[PDB]
Design a protein around this ligand. Structure first.
Ligand SMILES: [Mg+2]
Ligand SMILES: [Mg+2]
Ligand SMILES: [Mg+2]
Ligand SMILES: [Mg+2]
Lengths: 209, 144, 41, 287, 263
RNA sequence: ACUUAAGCAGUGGAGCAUGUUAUUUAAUUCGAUAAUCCACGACUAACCUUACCAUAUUUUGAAUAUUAUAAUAAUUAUAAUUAUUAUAUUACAGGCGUUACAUUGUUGUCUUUAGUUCGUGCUGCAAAGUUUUAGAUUAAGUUCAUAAACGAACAAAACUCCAUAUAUAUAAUUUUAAUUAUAUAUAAUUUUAUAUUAUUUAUUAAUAUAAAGAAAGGAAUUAAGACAAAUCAUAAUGAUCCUUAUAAUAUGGGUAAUAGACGUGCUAUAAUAAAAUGAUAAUAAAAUUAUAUAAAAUAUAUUUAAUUAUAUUUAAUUAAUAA
RNA sequence: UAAGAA
């Protein structure tokens, strides 16, 4: 769980559903309450139907409200379920989230918040990739760690070897291309990423490692 | 083999800081967050932006973390306000406005910002407006 | 929720809570346990 | 290091030369860079950030906190698919894992555990369950039921084996373990002419008294049903016999195999032990 | 740009382009969307791109998902998607990469806007105004303006300087020589700044008007400053000068290797 | 081994405050009741809060939906549809009504958590068993060792996190507390050497003495059973009851009544202890200040002044700055 | 030419 690396630890900011700091505490309390109310509204908005006997129940996680200085971004994960020539109901829902010209949801929310609002829906293809969605749906280890540790040791040793080779052949060592010789986006990122695999479950606590 | 120019190399190193020439403080930027990660990342980004804009910026001075505490009757909860200070020196108002606009445009989730601007310069009522109305009303004017 | 019918008429949303409340109201009214008629002037 | 715009034109897009020029003009080439002790800005690998990666960068036209488009300019209209599928091969299969019959698994496991041939097990052995029971144990938290399976396996060529398996969950698992055990217990059964037993056998196995008698060619398997299944697996074709005292199926099954292996002596063994020639009269009558 | 709003011009183009334009039309118009024959013909042209019959695509075009109907869960995990928890880390890295690309290629462009510092002369500009801005917030304190000046930099004669300090009262701090006053009584900072400027003008005019009273008999009251100073700890002590022992300081010892390496 | 017992340090007969109970009351809103004891929540009850009492007053009410009307904007080709707001319409809403209204859940307390399953292997015909072992050691599962058993998963431990000590970075040392702040990293679950005691004989343990160390504390983190709980104010669902009233509003009253009884706290009953005074101001930490905070000064009590309490006036600070 | 089952 390397804290110095953004692929190897969850940012502590992400363990709050409302991610905000306002110098004006009144406004911060108001924004927290707004986020809770909008989450309840969005939950109400995830059930659709194409006439009777055609009910469709999208399952969304809790919203993640990212408040920045000039914008709010409401990110949420969701789970759903010849097609090129019409729009199914879930597509219509998401398109009213952002893409409609006249009365899209983010403009109305922008008035509610008095700051720009965007909505970021993220589809999850399985239901056991998110404990919240898995719970809302069922309402209606050593070897992997060893491989991960081996990869981390290999990357560290690779950088060390690179740097000593530069020193052989102040603190500024040399050009970046040689300090990071075999250290590319095509091998390092996915090998250092954490929480790739579900290693345990208890039906709703999902353990990802 | 592949040329990596200086701008890309600078991303892989600590941000550069321009020297302070007169020591005229022109603004201080206080950043606050309930976590320290986004706060420090954003502070580094502000330093980079300021360097390229030509602004001497000292650095994200650590300021005392405020602790708030709540007891639930005996479960303890607390909230930590982390605070960084970036001061700007020897810069024109317009460049500094550009800095503030740019870093506002590209701000991070959960970070608030207060900006004090110091501008050196040459030397050279609702109740009251209602009290008059009440006193010029027949109910009060009759006793006077 | 009620505004959604006017903003997005080509989407027909369903309020699960409201539908459950109506189903319970009709179920009580089938057993004869429904609310009496409110007195009127 | 500072580079000629001539060289950079060949390696970097046209729209990026301006920023590189301005950087090289604003950063003196003597600049000494320090690494940051506590804040990591660049990723842990090398990247010139000229290419938008389909997975590791925000998808263009997608709303998010740092989306630079306006609200009325996002270019994602189809929400049925994951917008950013995984990079590289498109999967995160751990090394040593495979993507998502019983005789095959028994054969593989037993070849790994004992070095026996899987092909022989899969293509030349036939299993036949003999007894399938629910036994139970009384424990302080109630009755715990177990499934018990006794099976026999053989190749109809003088090799037979009994196996017992036991499972608290499913009969499939108990039968699988019984099949495993039976293959592990494979023995060689003496047979006269590859069809019957050499003489007669009067064998006691615990409470079971077995009386087996060799039979003529064309004579069937006129025996207890458990013994019939064992004979079918072992390649015994002609046999007569009777069971006395206990007629427990498990004990019959187990004791008939000791009867076949221990209470039989081949003609060769007798001849060599006694130093005499044992001649089969019918074998010699027909030349 | 608005080609999706003009289905007439979809004639031609790649079939995938026509599909994207059709989807954009539906997404943007929402319920305001309505059938248009030219769009339907453009989609008939794509009928070959996707293995769908002409009749079926016209049926779906007219009756939508109803037409589709008229014509899982707990699946095995194919290891082709990440958990949302790992997707949070991927998003953290996407944010990092976005900022790195900004720092690589857009921040250097800001170097065009560098200006040389037009240092206002301290003698000419001795008054400092402090403004406050809470970025992205409606904070009541953003209207506050603070005016500070060192009184000896006001161009006052001694009698007028004394009168200034006497009239400033608690706003004047004799220890630092700082006259400071703040205003947040007006809704906007510009009003508060002009108000503070006007107060300063009245104070200076009265301080220079010695024709009636110079207040030379009134000494300078420093009680507010004493009360202020009692609330801050005063570490006003230094190591005795005569206790110092430079004789005891370590002396650099000659080292031949370093000198022969500075060659 | 909770508990007891012992020892140490207290508190403890009064007044008051605050609870509970009893009685009283229009109301004194609510809380226990299978024989030791025990009805006992308040991060603020003048109005509000409030749940209670008295007297007035409201009647589709706070919701959602249907159906009409009356307008108001948009669109057709002038009426019309589309919506928004009001009025009515009745399904209803509403309920600090019911636990003698049942379920789950959750919460509390307690017992057990080096143990439970699974997989192989082995023993017994088998149900079953998995064997040394009723192991050693520690305050402790603590630390170890061992066996036809060996693993795995969880659990425990390690780990982690505080704190402590140190290094780097940051601060143009006037936001000063650099004796500081807060990011990152390191450290220990300490280690070595003898001597004496014991030993399962050392490469063990304890004690003592030396040596190096700043090193001496704390928190969290899993399940399984048992019982309790409706201020379960830790919910949801269901059942049942009221619907001009068990819902809703206003005015005042009560929750503050006083024979008792008890719990808790505060102030005392004087000299190892109370009082007064102590201005270049002995010596803190942790908090708070945009639904504020209140400096210095002046005036009165008031007596040269000080102290103390108010008033007048609001300086600075929305804060490492000022209070 | 000797079969067992509940
Ligand atoms: Mg009251
Ligand atoms: Mg009242
Ligand atoms: Mg009801
Ligand atoms: Mg009531």
């Amino acid at each position: 769980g390397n804290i110095n690396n953004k692929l190897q630890h969850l940012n502590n900011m992400n363990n709050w559903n409302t991610q905000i700091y306002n110098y004006n505490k009144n406004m911060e309390i108001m924004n927290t309450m707004n986020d809770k109310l909008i989450n309840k509204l969005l939950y109400k908005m995830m059930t659709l139907k194409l006439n009777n006997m055609n009910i469709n129940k999208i399952i969304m996680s809790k919203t993640i409200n990212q408040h920045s200085l000039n914008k709010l971004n409401i990110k949420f994960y969701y789970y759903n379920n010849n097609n090129n020539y019409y729009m199914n109901m879930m597509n219509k829902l998401m398109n009213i989230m952002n893409n409609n010209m006249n009365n899209n949801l983010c403009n109305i929310l922008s008035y509610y918040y008095k700051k720009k609002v965007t909505i970021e829906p993220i589809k999850l293809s399985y239901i056991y990739l998110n404990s919240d969605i898995f719970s809302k749906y069922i309402s209606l280890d050593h070897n992997i760690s060893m491989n991960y540790i081996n990869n981390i040791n290999n990357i560290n040793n690779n950088k060390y070897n690179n740097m000593i080779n530069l020193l052989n052949n102040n603190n500024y060592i040399g050009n970046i291309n040689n300090i990071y010789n075999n250290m590319t986006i095509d091998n390092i990122p996915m090998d250092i990423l954490m929480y790739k695999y579900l290693v345990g479950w208890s039906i709703v606590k999902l353990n990802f490692i | 083999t592949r040329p990596y120019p200086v701008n890309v190399e600078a991303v892989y190193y600590a941000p550069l800081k321009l020297p302070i020439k007169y020591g005229d403080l022109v603004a201080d930027i206080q950043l606050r967050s309930y976590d320290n990660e986004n706060l420090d990342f954003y502070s580094d980004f502000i330093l980079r932006t300021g360097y390229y804009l030509g602004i001497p910026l000292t650095g994200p001075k650590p300021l005392p973390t405020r602790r708030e505490r709540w007891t639930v009757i005996k479960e303890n909860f607390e909230r930590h306000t982390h605070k960084r200070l970036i001061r700007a020196w020897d810069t024109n108002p317009e460049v500094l406005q550009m800095l503030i606009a740019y870093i506002t445009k590209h701000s991070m989730a959960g970070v608030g910002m207060k900006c004090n601007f110091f501008q050196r310069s040459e030397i050279s009522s609702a109740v009251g407006q209602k009290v008059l109305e009440l006193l010029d009303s027949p109910d009060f004017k009759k006793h006077l | 929720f009620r505004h959604l019918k006017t903003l997005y008429p080509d989407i027909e949303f369903v309020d699960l809570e409201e539908q459950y409340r109506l189903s319970m109201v009709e179920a009580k009214k089938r057993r004869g346990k429904g609310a009496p008629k409110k007195m009127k002037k | 290091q500072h580079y000629d715009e001539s060289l950079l034109s060949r390696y970097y897009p046209e729209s990026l030369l301006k920023s590189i020029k301005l950087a090289q003009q604003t950063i003196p080439e003597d600049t000494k860079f320090r690494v940051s002790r506590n804040v990591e800005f660049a990723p842990p690998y090398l990247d010139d950030f000229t290419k938008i990666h389909p997975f590791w960068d925000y998808k263009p036209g997608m709303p998010h906190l740092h989306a630079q488009e306006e609200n009325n300019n996002f270019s994602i209209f189809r929400w049925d698919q994951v917008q950013q599928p995984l990079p590289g091969e498109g999967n995160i299969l751990p090394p040593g894992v495979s993507l998502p019959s019983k005789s095959a698994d028994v054969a593989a496991g037993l070849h790994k555990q004992t070095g026996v041939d899987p092909d022989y097990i899969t293509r030349k052995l036939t299993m036949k369950p003999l007894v399938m029971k629910r036994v139970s144990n009384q424990t302080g938290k109630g009755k715990i039921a177990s499934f018990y399976a006794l099976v026999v396996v053989g190749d109809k060529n003088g090799m037979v084996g009994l196996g017992e398996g036991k499972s608290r969950e499913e009969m499939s698992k108990a039968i699988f373990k019984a099949h495993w055990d039976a293959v592990r217990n494979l023995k060689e059964i003496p047979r006269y002419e590859n069809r019957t037993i050499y003489g007669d056998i009067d064998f006691r196995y615990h409470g079971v008294k077995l009386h087996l008698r060799s039979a003529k060619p064309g004579f069937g398997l006129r025996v207890n049903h458990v013994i019939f299944e064992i004979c079918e697996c072992a390649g015994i074709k002609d046999l007569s016999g009777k069971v006395y005292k206990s007629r427990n199926d498990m004990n019959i099954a187990k004791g008939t195999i000791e009867a076949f292996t221990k209470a039989q002596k081949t003609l060769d063994e007798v001849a060599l032990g006694r130093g005499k020639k044992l001649v089969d009269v019918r074998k010699v009558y027909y030349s | 740009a608005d080609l999706y709003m003009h289905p007439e011009k979809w004639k031609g183009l790649p079939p995938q382009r026509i599909l994207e334009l059709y989807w954009e039309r539906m997404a943007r118009l929402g319920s305001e969307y309505k059938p248009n024959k030219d769009e339907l013909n453009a989609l008939l042209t794509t009928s070959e791109y996707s293995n769908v019959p002409v009749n079926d695509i016209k049926k779906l075009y007219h009756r939508g998902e109803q037409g589709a109907i008229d014509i899982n869960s707990l699946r095995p995990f194919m290891f082709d998607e990440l958990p949302s928890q790992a997707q949070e880390l991927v998003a953290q890295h996407r944010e990092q990469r976005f900022y790195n690309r900004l720092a690589a290629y857009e921040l250097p462009l800001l170097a065009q806007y560098r200006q040389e510092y037009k240092r206002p002369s301290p003698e000419s500009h001795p008054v400092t105004y402090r403004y406050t801005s809470y970025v992205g917030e409606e904070h009541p304190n953003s209207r506050k303006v603070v005016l500070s000046v060192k009184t000896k930099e006001l161009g006052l004669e001694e009698k007028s300087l004394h009168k200034f300090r006497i009239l400033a009262r608690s706003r004047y701090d004799h220890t630092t020589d700082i006259f400071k006053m703040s205003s947040d009584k007006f809704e906007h900072a510009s009003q508060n700044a002009r108000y503070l400027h006007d107060i300063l003008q009245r104070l200076l005019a009265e301080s220079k008007d010695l024709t009636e009273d110079d207040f030379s008999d009134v000494p300078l009251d420093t009680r507010h400053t004493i009360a202020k100073s009692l609330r801050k700890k005063k570490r006003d002590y230094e190591f005795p000068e005569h206790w110092k022992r430079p004789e005891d300081a370590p002396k650099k010892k000659f080292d031949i290797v370093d000198q022969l390496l500075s060659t």
